[PDB]
Amino acid sequence: IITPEKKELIRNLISEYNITSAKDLQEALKDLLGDTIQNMLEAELDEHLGYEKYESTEEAKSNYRNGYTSKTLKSSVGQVEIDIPRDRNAEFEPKIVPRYKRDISEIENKIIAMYARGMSTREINEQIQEIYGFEVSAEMVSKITDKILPEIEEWQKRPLGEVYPIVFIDAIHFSVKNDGIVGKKAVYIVLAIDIEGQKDVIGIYVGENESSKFWLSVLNDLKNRGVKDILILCADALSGIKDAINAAFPNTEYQRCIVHQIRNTLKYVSDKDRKEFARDLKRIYTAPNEKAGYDQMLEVSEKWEKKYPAAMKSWKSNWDVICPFFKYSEELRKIMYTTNTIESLNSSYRRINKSRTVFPGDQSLLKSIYLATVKITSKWTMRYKNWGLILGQLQIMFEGR
Amino acid sequence: KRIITPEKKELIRNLISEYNITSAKDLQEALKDLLGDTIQNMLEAELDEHLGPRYKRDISEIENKIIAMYARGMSTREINEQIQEIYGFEVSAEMVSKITDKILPEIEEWQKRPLGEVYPIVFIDAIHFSVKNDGIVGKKAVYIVLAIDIEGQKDVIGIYVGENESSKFWLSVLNDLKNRGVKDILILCADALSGIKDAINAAFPNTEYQRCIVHQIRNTLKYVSDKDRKEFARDLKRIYTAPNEKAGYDQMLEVSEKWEKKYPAAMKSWKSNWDVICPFFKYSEELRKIMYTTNTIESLNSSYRRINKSRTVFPGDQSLLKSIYLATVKITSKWTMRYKNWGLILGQLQIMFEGR
DNA sequence: GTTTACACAAAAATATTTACACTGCCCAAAA
DNA sequence: TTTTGGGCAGTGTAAATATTTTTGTGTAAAC
């Protein structure tokens, strides 16, 4: 795609700017960008005033141009200086480079993508100064990433699908400066798999876990747009969620989250060197029926009563909520006990917010979490394996859906 | 002021007509799509100009940016993406290596810079070895020699590599230091093994100095667990806060009796080396603090870890030296601040070594 | 006669700096 | 022995803060 006219243009620009090396070529690149912008601005001024430099007009020329004024631009190649013309009454408006605009490059989206990757504002400042030439302070990075706040509000009011077969609820704790004191806030991510087998984060909510109805409030938000029943929801049983869903979504079959149970009870305080009893814990959720699952749970409890005893106690306490997991098919069971669909989420946030220790205000935390969630969900075009079969099993197990 | 010529006016007009330029981004992408391959070919021809210091080739702006990205530990795909986004052409890993090869005369000048005659304190530290390849693999180790001089500025003096415990390697290091201009070292701290005794007694022996403190703690707590290192940290904190040397001996015997059943073979070495560690307590509290701070060593180790993760790609015969030099200069650029309460330390050093 | 360039300030838009209010993370240590 | 404090090193960003650009208008030079 090399046009001979482009070749002649290259030869002419090499001849006019006297390019003899690569350094000369880059200097001439900067000079050529500046000259082109200045020429276009002079053409725009000629179009605005309606006459060229020093040319008479029959009608009384209402306003005279009165020289140039300097301005330094921030471009992709580097920092360039140009001279822009000016009208006496200051009526002319530049088109390519508008008034007071010096960051003509399109680095905004790149800065936002770097901040979503987990880079600090000062890290981004140093990186941009090193690999671009011009300076962008940390507060400038903050004001640039503030531009997606209407996007955040539209994502919070984003219209969701009608039916969601499987839902997961996860919690991630951070520190937040509220009312002048730094306390602690837990952010709850509501992820869901749709009818086609595609998982996509549907909700992100700031916790404020002082009251229980706030939890219910989240469901009410779903009641605002997710008006259909959820065939299965998987949440870490905490803070009186049972009453919330049973009064909001009573049709939903509420089971204890298997992977959250594994994370919270058998591994919160676990012997690090021999964590590999999940291979036997698989024996619990690879059982055909719930009675065999209870028997294998008793067996592994007998196996693990030598270590700290409080591990298997939670299984005995919550088996009443864990029992509906066995009614599902093996392909359905797979979706339950796969911690990789949950851990990979949490760890991802952990690997994104590794450098952000304390978030000033709720909205900064919300910005960072929305950016991380978008960066993660961008690659989530893969559908679920053996889906459609799962849809048939769902419609058989739930005849009215 | 830029007075433009009518021929350049026609050039700009033809450019705008060819690329249909209406906004600034249109102009930038037009310049990219027009000059990408041109810049690529010019760069490859200018780097292959020798085979296609006395003669040090000049560096370009884009080459300086590539050097900066090389120092930041960026992946080859990532720097390729950045260059494609800015200038509009691809850079292969071999091109990256050929571009980075241009800072070698700078490394020569940095390794041959004239030094002062007397340096109060000198440390030599070792880090892990990402072995270079010219047909062999090595058991050798990377050493950085950093010294604090009569004033209060810290600066890395040398970067060396060798057989790691031959007396000849240490002797060559000290002889290079003496050739660069050094004539007497007041305090030297090296990794305690063979060879350094003879190297000191044959290279810089105004007085014997085997004062090793930060080297001993790391050498003894390397073969222990980080979970217990905090308890080891508390016990060694009790060990280095002793006012007298005999109190330090008592604390050492106590911690050895406490830890000889969980890790018997480590602290034994300490006892075996206690004859050498004794003169450390002769210093005042300030000299002790300046010695065992190790914060600069930890910063250097973190930079070298960022280099070992991402920069060990090409032959380290020049690449390892480039990476270490870039990390050291990145530290020393903003590492020019003077030292804390250096005047009292200087008085104590001048009274402690009076015949200077 | 006109037209534009240039030079001073003052206003306005923008981007840098300071200041949090902490979190981690080492120690120098007391009860 | 475990619990305090005390620097240091980070963070995102509100609020003073400095900087750069644009403007008002008066001249000096140019067409």
Residue numbers in the entry:
A (entry chain A): 6 to 406
B (entry chain B): 4 to 55, 103 to 406
The paper states:
The pre‐reaction complex (PRC) is a complex of TnpA with DNA representing the first 26 bp of the R‐TIR with six flanking bp (fR‐TIR26); the pre‐cleaved complex (PCC) is a complex with the first 26 bp of the R‐TIR (R‐TIR26); and strand transfer complex 1 (STC1) is a complex with oligonucleotide R26(j6)L15‐5′rec in which a 6‐bp bridging spacer links two TIRs and is an approximation of the Figure‐eight intermediate. In each structure, the R‐TIR is recognized through an extensive protein–DNA interface in which almost all of the interactions are contributed by one protomer (“A”) with the exception of the transposon tip which is directed toward the catalytic domain (“CD”; residues 165–261 + 325–407) of the second protomer (“B”), suggesting that catalysis occurs in trans.
The PRC structure captures the binding state before the initial nicking step on the donor TIR, where we observed TnpA interacting with both the donor TIR and flanking DNA. The scissile phosphate in fR‐TIR26 is displaced ~ 8 Å from the position of the R‐TIR26 3′‐OH in the PCC structure and ~ 16 Å from the equivalent position of the scissile phosphate in Hermes when bound to DNA (Hickman et al, 2018). Although the resolution of the structures is limited and none of them contains metal ions in the active sites, in the PCC and PRC, the side chains of D175 and D241 are in the appropriate conformation for metal binding and catalysis whereas the side chain of E348 is pointing away from the presumed metal‐binding site. When we superimposed the A protomers of the PCC and PRC structures (which can be done with an overall r.m.s.d. of ~ 1.1 Å over 400 Cα positions), the clear difference is a ~ 6 Å change in the position of IDB as it closes down on the transposon end in the absence of the flanking sequence. The inherent mobility of the ID is supported by a normal mode analysis using iMODS (López‐Blanco et al, 2014) in the absence of DNA which indicated that the ID can move relative to the CD. Furthermore, the primary mode of ID motion is consistent with the motion seen in the comparison of the two complex structures. The structures and the iMODS analysis suggest that the relative flexibility of the ID and CD domains may be key to a conformation change that transiently places the transposon end in the trans‐active site of CDB.
